[PDB]
Ligand binder design. Structure first.
Ligand SMILES: Nc1ncnc2c1ncn2[C@@H]1O[C@H](COP(=O)(O)OP(=O)(O)OP(=O)(O)O)[C@@H](O)[C@H]1O
Ligand SMILES: Nc1ncnc2c1ncn2[C@@H]1O[C@H](COP(=O)(O)OP(=O)(O)OP(=O)(O)O)[C@@H](O)[C@H]1O
Ligand SMILES: Nc1ncnc2c1ncn2[C@@H]1O[C@H](COP(=O)(O)OP(=O)(O)OP(=O)(O)O)[C@@H](O)[C@H]1O
Ligand SMILES: Nc1ncnc2c1ncn2[C@@H]1O[C@H](COP(=O)(O)OP(=O)(O)OP(=O)(O)O)[C@@H](O)[C@H]1O
Ligand SMILES: [Mg+2]
Ligand SMILES: [Mg+2]
Ligand SMILES: [Mg+2]
Ligand SMILES: [Mg+2]
Ligand SMILES: [Mg+2]
Ligand SMILES: [Mg+2]
Ligand SMILES: [Mg+2]
Ligand SMILES: [Mg+2]
Lengths: 305, 307, 305, 307
């Protein structure tokens, strides 16, 4: 198996707090927050650790929040490589409401990155050995032009770095601009936005995914379909894998868990079918903070029936 | 093709209205109601009509609301057979909230049936010829014992009427009490209650469905799974059908549409696979717009599922 | 004291039901409804009965719902005079949500009235003896043109019937069109709509109310101000009465209770001050289905300190 | 006019953001935060500035967030006196929901203060000269004993600093423990808890307020009543002031504005009536827009109340 790294341009120190009620106008008294590592590539790395593998998380860190984010990851035994940033690591807020048992997630943009920090992030990435896998996951923070994302991925690819991309909107297009991307995991929304047309017909998602493979923009496209699972596309195969008929308790961390699972499968040179199954297994395991090894194992064995 | 009848012991004259915002305390000013046919078996009969089929809807009807329910179905070319009830046909409320674009459905019990009005309904049911299909769908209204429902199904079965059941709670249990139902469509919640245990493992739903078949309660169990489609089970077969990757705009009224589709397939003696696929096609067709499934959407999805 | 009658052009059989949760999309299973008399003039009459007086409620009734509405009022010992209508008496739905303890009120328009029923309603009103008081309260149902409301009030007034009006929007203007109205109780919204300008300045409400008295459109204008009470205006006096600093548990039935109280005071030829105080007392008592005699008494004694 | 100082043991760097809709489960995408000064005594000092007065805000500040809180107040010409804390200044979240136009405020505890950082804050407080006014407003942060707050008020009083208190829970009780507070502004909830009983009768709030005065805990009790205005109580007087019949757009941050107004009146030795009227004027001025009271709106309302 090859080495795995992730990149999170917009990391977060996520604070989880509780309040009895949610209602407008008044003050909602919240408990003192419990902190946790936030960000796409970061969660992908944590999911990989849950699933037994190892992934180095690359990201910018600033202020005492950044230091706290780095310290959480140390406690969870996830390797990191950071560049210090001027703007302090931002905080997303997850609020649990007692009276309903429900969660609310307020996701702000990440901290800003100036030209210089991005170049430091690029230097760190180009340190990755050839053949190794890099998962670029999450949104694009303020201060980064889309052309700079494209240049990073080209640069990485020019020296044998295998690139996996999970992102949104123009950031996704910027990633696929150069092409030869190893793996992309848009959900439905991200797919419709990337292709710029509504996906209203039964075969629309498949045709759109197949187009991306055929145009060479990506070697593999896995479209995640929430409860319906995921549809995966090669130059060779096309496959849909549906999760077990089991009730979902939350949505949090499904995408990143799936991406981590599929990354571990890609690194192991598994078949397209193995990869999507393991991805759906981990994605759905997370819906039962992320995916556990035993839950993923159970679901993967069932799909592998 | 055999004849198809549906039974709705608790029909409804539902009102669809629009209000700008939803919030407690204040008066929520609602637009003039737009009336629509309500009830399980009624909507199964409406879906069958849309799918180019035909089914006679048997239901009680009382008062000006009863008359408007009947007249609504007349305008839809849905054949009916009604019994006049003393208590007025009830009205559930469907509220569209402009601000969020959301819909709320407030579902109240059906009007009461006295024992005479029930007797007339069973009499209409027992006029159905042997070999024809009867779909019993929806909740049980006040004034009817559970035993009355079981006795009705036993009597109909005794004269060769093939029964399809869609219900919940204690009513679903009692429909399955004497067994030999042709087809039941529980969702995940209804299957769990029916079998009286948690379905949390990957293979539980399938096993729960098979258990109902092996016990003789039903020849066919199709567990509907919302966006995950459906898991259909036979004495010989088991198939899951997943709908196409198209997002849904609503959930009303997907269960009834599916049941309408599968009843039609049953009337055609189609294989289990075709029944379930056509079920998912119609159900998912109904989710495509915020009343039921249409012929063309269903055909489109079914052809995709059959490819 | 003179005799009191009310008129409700848009009556309602209100059904109150309970559900554990309120949420979009799914089916909200509601208990079998508990029915209660709905409509402005109807509630005004019930409030008058609670406060010891007697008021005859005039309204159209149709279908089994109308019959049920009539039967509820019989049980509460409120006199009625009905005309039978073709369109069945409509049902507004009040939903109590267990998980929050909150109420939601869905108010549809009343049943339609054709030309003929309205004339029957007019005939019933013109049967009222001269000098007696008629409270016209509530919204205008489908099938009634605003000119017909105006004609009814003129007709009533032409033969000594004392008219009190509580309504909304154009219906309110239609009422004041003829002028010499005994008493109007707009709230803030209704006042701003009646006068057609935003009431943004401190003295705006008073000036607007005073204008109506001075123009002769109404002998008395009481603007209700929710928790701030009510501001009442004569040709002579101008007075604001504020409720006791007591927490409010619900809003339901505040306006109608206030109007009933003030009607009883008007019938007793009380001063403007007595009238508004008793109105605020009953209005606020209701916020603690309507106003109780003891609660109103308590608050009225406090205001009368 | 004497000098005015405020104390905020739990200041905040609050972020105001906008999201289209609010609902559980999904990610609620929020716009880039817009930062604003948070904290009781800070906002009292900001309101005083708006009202054309001057007050020095004493508070702890840590990290880049602390620096931005300080810089925000600099841009507002609010004099400050800060103590550097180790733990970073916290951030509450204010969320504007476009769909409904509503605002949600998620209010978390202030950053911790160690005993040394508290010592420095008291040292800054005790540099205030006799006869000057100190407003202690807001919650108590972690790491501070209730006794530390009481000792601070006793020490300040001992050297002639006139103290105004706005707080809640156990902190408010302890501020009133040694008595002789110049002015406390509880709302209805805070008054009820403070006196530890239900205020349900018409005359209860007034009696509760008078009880606090007669006990010596405070010379002036002004109970704020939301839209009903305020009930101010003295050893000699009692006055309720109701705001004008103008609807409010927000409730943020009406309490602090009122306190700022009344502090200014106290510094002018105005009668109780003028203090309360000016209090309601500023408080209600702040409710006129969705940050605090403005000079012109306050003047307008006060002139109306004084007519
Ligand atoms: N409601 C659900 N029930 C069962 N499995 C689910 C459910 N939602 C997501 N999953 C599993 O997680 C995988 C990824 O989730 P999803 O399709 O929603 O991608 P995503 O939207 O990018 O996730 P995220 O919103 O966290 O970034 C799915 O393929 C599926 O296997
Ligand atoms: N969110 C969805 N996305 C795609 N298809 C759906 C969705 N929800 C329902 N369907 C289709 O409709 C069929 C029946 O719906 P469902 O599984 O929710 O049964 P149900 O709960 O009895 O419906 P109902 O609440 O109307 O009685 C499903 O099998 C599926 O084919
Ligand atoms: N929140 C409250 N707290 C104390 N008293 C209240 C409150 N709301 C209403 N009242 C009392 O009830 C009286 C009438 O209520 P209001 O001003 O809201 O008129 P309204 O809006 O026409 O009532 P409704 O919405 O029921 O038709 C007020 O003058 C006041 O005395
Ligand atoms: N809804 C309103 N309408 C008119 N004026 C208001 C309203 N709410 C508050 N005010 C004004 O602001 C003053 C203080 O507000 P309030 O009574 O709610 O105290 P508070 O609860 O401590 O405020 P805060 O929650 O900001 O600490 C009130 O006395 C009143 O003058
Ligand atoms: Mg408040
Ligand atoms: Mg999603
Ligand atoms: Mg994702
Ligand atoms: Mg169903
Ligand atoms: Mg359902
Ligand atoms: Mg109102
Ligand atoms: Mg009213
Ligand atoms: Mg306060």
């Amino acid at each position: 198996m090859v080495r795995i790294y992730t990149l999170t341009l917009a990391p977060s120190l996520d604070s989880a707090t509780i309040t009895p009620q949610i209602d407008p106008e008044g003050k909602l008294r919240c408990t003192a927050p419990v902190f946790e590592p936030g960000g796409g590539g970061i969660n992908v790395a944590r999911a990989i650790a849950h699933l037994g593998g190892s992934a180095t998380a690359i990201f910018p860190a600033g202020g005492a929040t950044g230091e706290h984010l780095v310290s959480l990851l140390a406690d969870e035994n996830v390797p990191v490589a950071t560049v210090e940033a001027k703007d302090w690591t931002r905080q997303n807020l997850h609020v649990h409401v007692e009276a309903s048992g429900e969660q609310y997630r307020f996701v702000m943009p990440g901290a800003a990155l100036n030209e210089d920090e991005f170049r430091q992030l690029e230097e760190q990435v180009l340190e990755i050995e050839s053949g190794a896998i890099l998962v670029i996951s999450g949104s694009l923070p303020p201060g980064v032009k889309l052309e700079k994302l494209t240049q990073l991925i080209s640069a990485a690819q020019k020296q044998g770095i295998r690139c996996i991309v999970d992102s949104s909107g123009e950031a996704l297009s910027a990633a696929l601009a150069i092409g030869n991307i190893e793996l992309v995991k848009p959900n439905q929304k991200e797919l419709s936005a990337l292709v710029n047309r509504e996906l209203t017909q039964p075969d629309d998602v498949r045709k759109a995914a197949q187009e991306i493979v055929n145009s060479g923009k990506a070697k593999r496209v896995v479209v995640s379909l929430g409860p319906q699972g995921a549809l995966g596309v090669d130059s060779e195969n096309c496959i849909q894998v549906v999760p077990p008929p089991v009730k979902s308790q939350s949505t949090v961390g499904a995408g990143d868990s799936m991406v981590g699972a599929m990354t571990l499968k890609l690194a192991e040179n598994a078949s397209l079918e193995e990869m999507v199954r393991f991805g759906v297994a981990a994605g759905s395991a997370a819906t039962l903070r992320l995916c556990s090894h035993d839950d993923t194992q159970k679901i993967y064995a069932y799909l592998s029936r």
